[PDB]
Design a binder for these strands. Sequence first.
RNA 1: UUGGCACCUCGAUGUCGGCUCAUCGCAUCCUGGGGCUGUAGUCGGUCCCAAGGGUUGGGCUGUUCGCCCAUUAAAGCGGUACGCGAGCUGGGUUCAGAACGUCGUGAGACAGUUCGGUCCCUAUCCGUCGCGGGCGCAGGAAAUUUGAGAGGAGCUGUCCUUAGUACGAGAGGACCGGGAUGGACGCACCGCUGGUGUACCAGUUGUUCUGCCAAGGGCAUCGCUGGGUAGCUAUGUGCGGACGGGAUAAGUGCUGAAAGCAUCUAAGCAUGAAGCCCCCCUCAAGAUGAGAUUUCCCAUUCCGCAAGGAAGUAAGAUCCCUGAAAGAUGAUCAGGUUGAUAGGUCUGAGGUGGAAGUGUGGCGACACAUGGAGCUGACAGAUACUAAUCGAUCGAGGACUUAACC
Lengths: 114, 122, 54, 207, 119
Amino acid sequence: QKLIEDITKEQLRTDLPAFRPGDTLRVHVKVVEGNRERIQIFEGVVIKRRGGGISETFTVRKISYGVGVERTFPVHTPKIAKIEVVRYGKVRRAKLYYLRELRGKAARIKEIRR
Amino acid sequence: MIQQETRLKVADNSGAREVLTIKVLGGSGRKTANIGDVIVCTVKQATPGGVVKKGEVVKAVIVRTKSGARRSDGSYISFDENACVIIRDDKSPRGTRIFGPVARELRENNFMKIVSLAPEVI
Amino acid sequence: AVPFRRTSKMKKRLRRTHFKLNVPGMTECPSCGEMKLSHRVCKACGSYNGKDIN
Amino acid sequence: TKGILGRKIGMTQVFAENGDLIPVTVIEAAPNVVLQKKTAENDGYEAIQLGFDDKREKLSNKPEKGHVAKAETAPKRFVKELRGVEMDAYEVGQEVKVEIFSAGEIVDVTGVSKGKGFQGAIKRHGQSRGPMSHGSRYHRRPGSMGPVDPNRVFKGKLLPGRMGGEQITVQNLEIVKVDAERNLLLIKGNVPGAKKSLITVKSAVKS
Amino acid sequence: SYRKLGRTSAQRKAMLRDLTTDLIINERIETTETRAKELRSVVEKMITLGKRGDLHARRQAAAYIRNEVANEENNQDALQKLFSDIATRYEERQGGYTRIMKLGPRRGDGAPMAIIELV
RNA sequence: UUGGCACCUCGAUGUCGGCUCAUCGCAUCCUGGGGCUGUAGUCGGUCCCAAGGGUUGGGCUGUUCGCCCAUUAAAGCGGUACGCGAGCUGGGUUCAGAACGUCGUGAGACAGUUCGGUCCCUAUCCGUCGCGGGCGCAGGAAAUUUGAGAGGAGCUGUCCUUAGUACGAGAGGACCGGGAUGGACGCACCGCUGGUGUACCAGUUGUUCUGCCAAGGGCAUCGCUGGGUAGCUAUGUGCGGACGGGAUAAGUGCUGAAAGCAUCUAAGCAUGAAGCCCCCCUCAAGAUGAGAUUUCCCAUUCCGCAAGGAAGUAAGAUCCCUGAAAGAUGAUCAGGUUGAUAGGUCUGAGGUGGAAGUGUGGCGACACAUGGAGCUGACAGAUACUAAUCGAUCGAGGACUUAACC
Ligand SMILES: [Mg+2]
Ligand SMILES: [Mg+2]
Ligand SMILES: [Mg+2]
Ligand SMILES: [Mg+2]
Ligand SMILES: [Mg+2]
Ligand SMILES: [Mg+2]
Ligand SMILES: [Mg+2]
Ligand SMILES: [Mg+2]
Ligand SMILES: [Mg+2]
Ligand SMILES: [Mg+2]
Ligand SMILES: [Mg+2]
Ligand SMILES: [Mg+2]
Ligand SMILES: [Mg+2]
Ligand SMILES: [Mg+2]
Ligand SMILES: [Mg+2]
Ligand SMILES: [Mg+2]
Ligand SMILES: [Mg+2]
Ligand SMILES: [Mg+2]
Ligand SMILES: [Mg+2]
Ligand SMILES: [Mg+2]
Ligand SMILES: [Zn+2]
């Protein structure tokens, strides 16, 4: 295991602020149309942070024009410029799966800062 | 993971509201079709006006699916409803508006007009 | 299904060449002198691996 | 050609400088040693034996020790043969090390799959099931057995039995990275065989 | 993995708890082979809990051990006996508190019996 | 196929459609190669060679048939008891109930219609799929191999260029050659996305126990609900059917007489297909024709005139014991005290999500701090603390005859 550990950790990334599930944050992703590199800003709620090591991923969810959209990344990808953190939130689960329904319908289903 | 008999709701000001999948174009089997593909489908509910009438046979592309595509860089993307856009027998759409965002695997294909008409692409 | 024909004595005896027992693995409890079986407690001497086990 | 022997470790990912996730198997090795050079007259062909992963002495008998003595090394555990290769880059006792595979290479991998024990037809051959409703009493069964006329069963009807656990070759895999320090190999894709098992790597033949 | 002993989950757990307390009391019990082979890996964990010796570990153990009387003339309960006596005895041995000895087979069903005991 | 005959079966050879599994023929549906054309090109028509692979989802009917919808390169025709009911179904078909139409004075009848209506069998032998034991192979063992022979695989679309070129008034629109990217099918695997995950973590209802509070246990489908490690998995990921060689079929030929000419042939020499034989993958010396190479052990003791037989051993292996990368049981593989094989302990990984106790705030349900805490099955490393003790059995002494060299 230790072999996998270090030969991977060579490629690790050491600038991401710590963050638990259930807190909004902005993400700066480098999309490229073949010519330039726009920087799409995509922010939402962290639904799930899964797995360990270089394989650790996470999930962000947001709504835009009625429909909700999910989006995941491997936390150590170089495709990401930076990760701000907007607001912490108090939750009890570690997988905010229940949010997939209580979004509209006037259901003010939000978090509360710690 | 759209397949035969799946129901979809269109995302344009064509006149239809929801549609039913009849056949998935492509090879011979083609059990299913993911995002960024074209199917043949029949209208089930339409607005009283609209350029499309209830109970026809038309072609449509797939713009959003609940199960979502997987990009090459390891990132994923998903939605929470299956949508589609009616095709005027060629990549040109038939309506004029587009509602809700669309995926990004359309620009990799030849659907320039749609991805231009979208409010935002993800 | 049903036996279509009876079975001769030859076949009946040939089938049973593998239906037998095996002489156990015996040893000598070097405390009493009887035949325990390996890796087990000599119930005669009540002793195993030198010492005794009440 | 050229090839070595190794051990399977596990799987993980790396990031190509393009920024593309890539599944990667990790096959380590140690310096393999040639043991015997099969000439063309004593033997009707041409090959070399490769040793690997020496064992402690209490597990080696006199014949094997004598056999290895010609190469002056410790008794190895696995001894395989490698046929198609030039026979002047090698002399008994020479070491073969991982650095003979540059990155971006294309190689072949050969192992033995992992066992699955006795298995039914549905899983062993991927047949279909009967309907599990509508008064049916048929599902997970190997189907019919053939026509009536032959009065027998043709050699080739597939039935349940022990599944998996045999040799397998996967072709046209690409070496990603090579580390001469830990003696590692990083391969795109995934190779057969359970962890901690023997694995053969040879240069691609379809070329 | 772990054996099943041909019993439902709940029955398995109950039998294990009972065997554990019985061993703590008698310090040498006798049963079938596989049963003891499975039992040791639980007895040792309980002994570790006892060696830790604080309120938290005590409540943890009580949530697993039954309520029998170990030494009645002293009215000592099995749990208290465990903590005080056992923790005081195996004070420094690092794991491996039990041992297993194999007897011949039984008569009524030929099962192989064995003796388990504290070191 | 509709029929003719009545040779076998009436001390029982059970129908039609569908499901699962297929296999064979070729008078070819697609893909491959050609001749002719009333073939400009792109489409075609017809005939010759070719059976390697491929050959669909629905609506209506018990339906085979049939019609229709939508695709595809194509939606082939037939045999195998109109394949396959000790493999499944029972819808129609032909028992007993009832009703309508028609016939009969009447019981009833109709190859007219309609509703309802018991499908039994523990595999003896051959056969097919897997796994072991014995013996053989002129001494006894451990490994690595050649490959007679057998099996597997064999499909194909779209787009961009060559080029709007050749061809064609125009309309339209190429062969040949390159390059990307799919469909279906197959093999492997769990790093990713997901599923399961009944000795993991948390929340919560009822009741009953641990004397009481606090804290916990039992039962209620695992009580219910939210997550989830390892393993096993597909809808997930990776890869495959490439490039070629030799001999051919239909065809096209060169040279050339029989027959001063002509002629693909009689003598000679070529070219020529998704077929054939190789190249790719797997099994394989019980291939009794029992192969080859490397290494180890040696040629004891008793009997036996003799023939030969018997007993202790060598190299090596097994009994027994700890197990899992293996597994129905055998078998295989890792180990047996100069050892990390398993369990426990310590340290980690991941999982869950803020323990108890105490204190503070609140009248109270509760909140906050101590504190990413506490707990943790299978995963990693170190550690001989416990268990693999002491022992037993099996196992060679190498036949003759020739020819080489001696
Ligand atoms: Mg006998
Ligand atoms: Mg099916
Ligand atoms: Mg016959
Ligand atoms: Mg229960
Ligand atoms: Mg009869
Ligand atoms: Mg023909
Ligand atoms: Mg029939
Ligand atoms: Mg017939
Ligand atoms: Mg039958
Ligand atoms: Mg009646
Ligand atoms: Mg009437
Ligand atoms: Mg009348
Ligand atoms: Mg009926
Ligand atoms: Mg049966
Ligand atoms: Mg039998
Ligand atoms: Mg994993
Ligand atoms: Mg209480
Ligand atoms: Mg009770
Ligand atoms: Mg649950
Ligand atoms: Mg292990
Ligand atoms: Zn004794």
